[PDB]
Enzyme design. Structure first.
Site, PDB file in Angstrom:
ATOM      1  CD  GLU A 116     119.260  20.541  69.579  1.00 27.75           C
ATOM      2  OE1 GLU A 116     119.320  21.041  70.684  1.00 27.75           O
ATOM      3  OE2 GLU A 116     119.247  21.210  68.376  1.00 27.75           O
ATOM      4  CG  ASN A 134     114.433  18.897  64.291  1.00 26.87           C
ATOM      5  OD1 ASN A 134     114.619  18.457  63.363  1.00 26.87           O
ATOM      6  ND2 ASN A 134     114.744  19.936  64.751  1.00 26.87           N
ATOM      7  CG  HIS A 184     122.303  23.438  62.248  1.00 30.91           C
ATOM      8  ND1 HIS A 184     122.017  24.433  61.373  1.00 30.91           N
ATOM      9  CD2 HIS A 184     121.558  23.103  63.167  1.00 30.91           C
ATOM     10  CE1 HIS A 184     120.909  25.070  62.048  1.00 30.91           C
ATOM     11  NE2 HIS A 184     120.149  24.048  62.940  1.00 30.91           N
ATOM     12  CD  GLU A 236     116.774  23.556  63.357  1.00 34.16           C
ATOM     13  OE1 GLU A 236     117.882  24.047  63.881  1.00 34.16           O
ATOM     14  OE2 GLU A 236     115.912  22.814  64.141  1.00 34.16           O
ATOM     15  CG  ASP A 289     123.179  26.386  59.139  1.00 34.71           C
ATOM     16  OD1 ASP A 289     123.402  25.500  59.237  1.00 34.71           O
ATOM     17  OD2 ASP A 289     122.589  27.372  60.007  1.00 34.71           O
TER      18      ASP A 289
END
EC number: 3.2.1.91
Length: 312
Positions: A127, A169, A205, A233, A235
């Protein structure tokens, strides 16, 4: 294939999950964990606060627990994460300039060195970019070290672990926009200048029904830079409660994401951020949303399950 692990194996891809070691004692959790995945990542066990809670005082218990699990069950281990503005213990946020840079390189050196040969890939920097393009402003790393910290972190990491794949990432970089464009610029530069960087992870995400239509395209341009890409990650959240249509659209979104990966020869695979909805981080951050994972709170497979399987 009776399992997603088998589906992913046959496609020659990784299908992982974010492990919370403390849940391995729940029979249904462990059963799914051992059967459906071929890769594992620590949800929180390998972050700065969990590893160096006090300057120069490392705590590897939880991290080792995750690494032991990977080794005993034969799964690939993904490291998360070395440098990250969130979950930075106060002692770190309290160091300035030089002092702060030594704490950073030292933290990167110890953690990488301690898991050398166990962790196959590391999220070296997580990030770093701001939504809308540019560098993240609220980062202690950016504020105290400026633009060069990313490079410092990657060089310190390659030197501590010469073979782990070193990745950067981020989230909201899944489609073409000002954030992924800034990320693209950074990779291209690093590559050209020889900075060790091997892969780019896309957190993914996502929100149900809002999967980027240019996901594949974005993935592909990054790969073209001579770097590997991975969904890290995953979802796909919705407004709770769920229902037939929501589940049906979510299933559809999961299929799209996996297919996007399957179409870019350099996409390593996909890691979902957890196993069951009951333990999902979503509700705690996005109040009102949830039902983001492949299994519900009662370990019942959702429609997304058969979706992922068909995608592989």
């Amino acid at each position: 294939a009776t399992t997603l692990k088998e589906a992913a194996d046959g496609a020659g891809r990784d299908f992982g999950f974010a492990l919370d070691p403390n849940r391995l004692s729940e029979a249904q959790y462990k059963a799914i964990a051992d059967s459906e995945f071929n890769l594992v990542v620590a949800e929180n066990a390998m972050k700065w606060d969990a590893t160096e809670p006090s300057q120069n005082s490392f705590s590897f218990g939880a991290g080792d627990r995750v690494a032991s699990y990977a080794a005993d069950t034969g799964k690939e281990l993904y490291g998360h994460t070395l440098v990250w503005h969130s979950q930075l213990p106060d002692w770190a946020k309290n160091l300035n300039g030089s002092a702060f840079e030594s704490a950073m390189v030292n933290h990167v050196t110890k953690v990488a060195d301690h898991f050398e040969g166990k962790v196959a890939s590391w999220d070296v920097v997580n990030e770093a970019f701001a939504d809308g393009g540019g560098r993240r402003q609220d980062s202690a790393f950016q504020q105290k070290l400026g633009n060069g910290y990313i490079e410092t972190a990657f060089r310190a990491a390659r030197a501590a672990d010469p073979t782990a794949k070193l990745c950067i990432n981020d989230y909201n970089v899944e489609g073409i926009n000002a954030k992924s464009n800034s990320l693209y610029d950074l990779v291209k530069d690093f590559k050209a200048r020889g900075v060790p960087l091997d892969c780019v992870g896309f957190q993914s995400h996502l929100i149900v029904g809002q999967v980027p239509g240019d996901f594949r395209q974005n993935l592909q341009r990054f790969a073209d830079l001579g770097v590997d890409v991975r969904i890290t990650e995953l979802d796909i959240r919705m407004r709770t409660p769920s229902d037939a249509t929501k589940l049906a659209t979510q299933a559809a979104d999961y299929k799209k994401v996996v297919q996007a990966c399957m179409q870019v020869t350099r996409c390593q695979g996909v890691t979902v951020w957890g196993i069951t909805d009951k333990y999902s981080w979503v509700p705690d951050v996005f109040p009102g949303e949830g039902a983001a994972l492949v299994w519900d709170a009662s370990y019942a497979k959702k429609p997304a399950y058969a979706a992922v399987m068909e995608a592989f």
